[PDB]
Amino acid sequence: APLISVEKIQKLAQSYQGDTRKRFTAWGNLIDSLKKKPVKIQLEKVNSFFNQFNYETDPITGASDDYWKSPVEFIVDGGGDCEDFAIIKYFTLVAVGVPSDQLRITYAASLTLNQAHMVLSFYPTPESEPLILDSLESKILKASARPDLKPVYSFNAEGLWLAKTSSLMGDSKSLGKWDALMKRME
C-alpha cells in the first residue's frame, strides 16, 4: 500500500531546483506540521494548501484529463485536474494520520456543470454524511449541502464502492489507472 513520507519528500526536493524544489519542501513541511493536530484542521489545511495549485482541464471537453497523476507528478507539474487534486489530498491526509478507511476519493456527476467531477470525501463514521473536499469550492461542506454532486463510485488504497442505487467492496486494483498510479508510487 503505497506511501508518502516526509523523508521521501525531502530527498525528492533535492533532485529538483527552483520553485519545484520549494514545492516539495512546502509539501513535506505541511505533512510535518499537521501530525497530531485536530482532524478538522488536518482536513482544512490539506484542502487549502492544494487548492492553490494549477487547475487543469481538457481543452476540448472542459472536463478531466484521461491520465491520473501520482502526488509526485502533481507536485512536479505544479497542478493537475480535479481528479489529481483529490488524489494528492487523499495521500497527504493519510500521511498526516487520518485513517485511510475514513477517506474515499469520489467520482461524482456534477448536475450543474453537466460533466463528471471528482472530490475527496471524508467520513466521520461509515454511516455519517461525508464532508466534501473540493477543488472548485474552498469550503468543506456536507454531502447534503452539495446537491450539485451526485456520487457514482468511490475508492481508496484498499477498496472500491459503488454508490447506492454497507455494500460489496470491490478490489481497488480493478481501476486500471488507479492500480497503475499506485505502482508508479512504489
Domains of the chain listed by start with CATH number: 1-186 (3.10.620.30)
Q: Is 148 part of any known ligand binding site?
A: no
Q: Is 179 part of any known ligand binding site?
A: no
Q: Is 32 part of any known ligand binding site?
A: no
d(CA 73, CA 79): 8
> Residue 157 to residues 101, 153, 175: CA-CA distances in angstroms?
9, 14, 11
Q: Is 56 part of any known ligand binding site?
A: no
Q: Is 84 part of any known ligand binding site?
A: yes
Matching residue, cell 455494500: 167
- For residue 100, give every residue at least 6 positions away whose Cβ sits within 8 Å of its Cβ, in sequence order, or none: 94, 156, 157, 158
- For residue 127, give every residue at least 6 positions away whose Cβ sits within 8 Å of its Cβ, in sequence order, or none: none
Structural method: X-ray
